[PDB]
Amino acid sequence: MEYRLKAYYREGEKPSALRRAGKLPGVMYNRHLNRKVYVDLVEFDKVFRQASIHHVIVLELPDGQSLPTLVRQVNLDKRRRRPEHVDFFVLSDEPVEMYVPLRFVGTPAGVRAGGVLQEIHRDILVKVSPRNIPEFIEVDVSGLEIGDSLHASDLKLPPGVELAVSPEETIAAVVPPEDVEKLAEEAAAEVAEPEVIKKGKEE
Amino acid sequence: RLTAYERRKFRVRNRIKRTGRLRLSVFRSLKHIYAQIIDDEKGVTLVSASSLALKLKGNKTEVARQVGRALAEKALALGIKQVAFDRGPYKYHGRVKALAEGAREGGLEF
Amino acid sequence: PLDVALKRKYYEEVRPELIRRFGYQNVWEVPRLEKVVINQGLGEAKEDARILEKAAQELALITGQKPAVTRAKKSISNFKLRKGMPIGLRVTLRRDRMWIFLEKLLNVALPRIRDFRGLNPNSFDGRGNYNLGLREQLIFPEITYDMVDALRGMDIAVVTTAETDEEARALLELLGFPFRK
């Protein structure tokens, strides 16, 4: 979909003051503009948990302007697991690199056999027109056993969208599951002591 | 990847420029020979001479020698006397050597 | 530059067929021979009798050129090898002696090889050069059974200006190199 988010301008307000008033600080940029912004945290969080660098967010500004952006970067407070700053990338008419959600259709035969589908990439990096952004990219994984894998070279891309990663990059795999029957093997598995790399006259 | 040519040139010339004298640089093409006296502190050439610019005759070795005399005569009229010879990538031999001998005959001190 | 039949065959016959087979637009683009490097990795003379001068007297008769000593890079215990030890001969043939050697090589030497069935078509550099080894040195017309003492072969590198294996296959085959496949 196409989400909307009120944004506001900030000059010399201190980020800790804005964040204490419930406002997430941010920035807007492309080759033409660079402006210090802030959004409302609860408002931004409602949108971002859905939009999430994948779908377009339109920023309604206080001067009346509206600008179509991709979230380019989210900085998290490593202690509290909270966003502390956003980068809004203002889209132009030229193509753009971006991540399109991968969507894994079907149940693998390995998963039926007891396995686990490891979704290695959940989106994929890609150049596409900002008027061409597909909602997702379907991938058939129903023929993967334990342990087969899928790569970006197996992506059936919609029209207008070019792969921006190496075709040899792994996107999914189906791996063996955890098994209690292996525990007693691993428990009674003696692992020898670490070797210390020879130093000096002995090497 | 430097060539043996570029290594030879750098090696010869670093040693020359360490002594702080004006260098007599010499470029030897298949056809012609050239000379500049260079102040490396200013990065500036003070006096030149070459077969191409004097439209000189046939035998490359005697041509080289005459180029040296020519360089000397113009050098002394500017006050230049002492100098350091910059064989660059060439052996001190033949055409280069002749140009050096020709410079010395003209009173360049080296 | 001497008049040698192989060199003349290169210019008169070989070059025209190469220009026609590949359509070169510059005369310097047509494949030619750069050098022929002969190597004896003797090593059976390391310490024993470093009187490989026997072999140097041989290669000098074969090529008209005095080969030069190869010395061991590092020391190798299993090969019984001390760094710096003399372990063979390399002689680099260019211009008329290169032609003069290759001339006798194709006419006389290769035919005298035991159970000869043609040069190995797959021995090409991947960049347009070729290599072949020899099992003996009596193969050559100058080295007679009388003068010989031991059976010493060699490596032969044939370096061309061709950028690809196909152009080099063309040039060598045209000069008279007998390939089996």
């Binding site: - | - | 005298r112 035991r114 159970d115 009596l138 059974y145």
Partner: protein
Amino acid sequence: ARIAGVEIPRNKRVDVALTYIYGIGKARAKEALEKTGINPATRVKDLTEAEVVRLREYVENTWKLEGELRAEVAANIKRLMDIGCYRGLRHRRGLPVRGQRTRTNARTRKGPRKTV
């Protein structure tokens, strides 16, 4: 590598020398020197060069020798070992081939005795 690729001994008679070739025995030595009219008692050191290539020519063109003979004998042992017949099995194991007893002897085919 005179004839034929084997540098046959000088000092010895021609019939005797040519036996030092894979494929030429006492029988074919008589055949080569008659068919080229060479005294069979002449030492190899005394063959006129005309005689040599005369002797060389007939020998190499008439009979399979050295490598071609050896490749052929091998090719026959190979095909016997591929078509899986009984003689082929005996060549597969290195055992004798012409029906001999193996409880004892057969040391030529088996090699020197292996202890137990």
